[PDB]
């Protein structure tokens, strides 16, 4: 049900932006042609749409390049050893301790700002 929550309020933002796009088409048609040159918003929409294509193409590139990591190792990872399991737990735990130590190095700063401002 929580995996539904975050999909629903995402789709609510997705749908509210498409209503806001279609209002540009609704406004451009109601604008008289002797003033339609003053309404930049269709060119703002196409510039934003191209910038959204340019962002999606970088995200699609990363997932291809991480799939090309995954298959290059899964072609060689011939079984699973208890020592790969040991070394996975050990590496993740040191990454966890290091990130808890980073979060301490921020969470105390948040309090120094809070006890200055409220």
């Amino acid at each position: 049900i929580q995996r539904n929550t975050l999909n629903i309020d995402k789709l609510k933002i997705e749908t509210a932006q498409e209503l806001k796009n279609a209002e540009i088409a609704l406004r451009t048609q109601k604008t008289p042609p002797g003033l339609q040159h003053e309404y930049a918003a269709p060119a703002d929409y196409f510039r934003i749409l191209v910038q959204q294509f340019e962002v999606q193409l970088q995200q699609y590139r990363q997932q291809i390049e991480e799939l090309e990591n995954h298959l290059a190792t899964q072609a060689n990872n011939s079984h699973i050893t208890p020592q790969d399991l040991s070394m996975a737990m050990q590496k993740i735990y040191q990454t966890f301790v290091a990130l808890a130590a980073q979060l301490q190095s921020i969470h105390e700063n948040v309090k120094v700002l809070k006890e200055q401002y409220l």
């Binding site: 975050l6 999909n7 995402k10 990872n77 996975a88 590496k91 290091a98 990130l99 301490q104």
Partner: protein
């Protein structure tokens, strides 16, 4: 007792699915050598921000405020990584 990892996995998938700022695409279920590499590829970004000279102490202040001891979990993970478990080399498949 007979209460296996699937109960803890169901909570692991929750901690992921309540941090996922939902993508347009699904995520990839890595094999264990990309898991080992993702750990170290991330630790090598953490340890340019935090010196290891203070790491375990700062983590114990933060997580000890919630009742975790780190040194116990480390010494468990040292004894678990010293444990001489099962002997490998699986026999030949099905038929030949």
């Amino acid at each position: 007792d007979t209460e296996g990892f699937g109960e803890l996995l169901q909570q692991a998938e929750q901690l992921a699915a309540e941090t996922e700022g939902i993508s347009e695409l699904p995520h990839v279920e890595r094999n264990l050598q990309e898991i080992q590499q993702a750990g170290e590829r991330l630790r090598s970004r953490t340890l340019t921000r935090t010196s290891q000279e203070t790491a375990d102490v700062k983590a114990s202040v933060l997580l000890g405020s919630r009742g975790l001891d780190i040194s116990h979990i480390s010494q468990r993970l040292e004894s678990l990584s010293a444990a001489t478990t099962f002997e490998p080399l699986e026999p030949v498949k099905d038929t030949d």
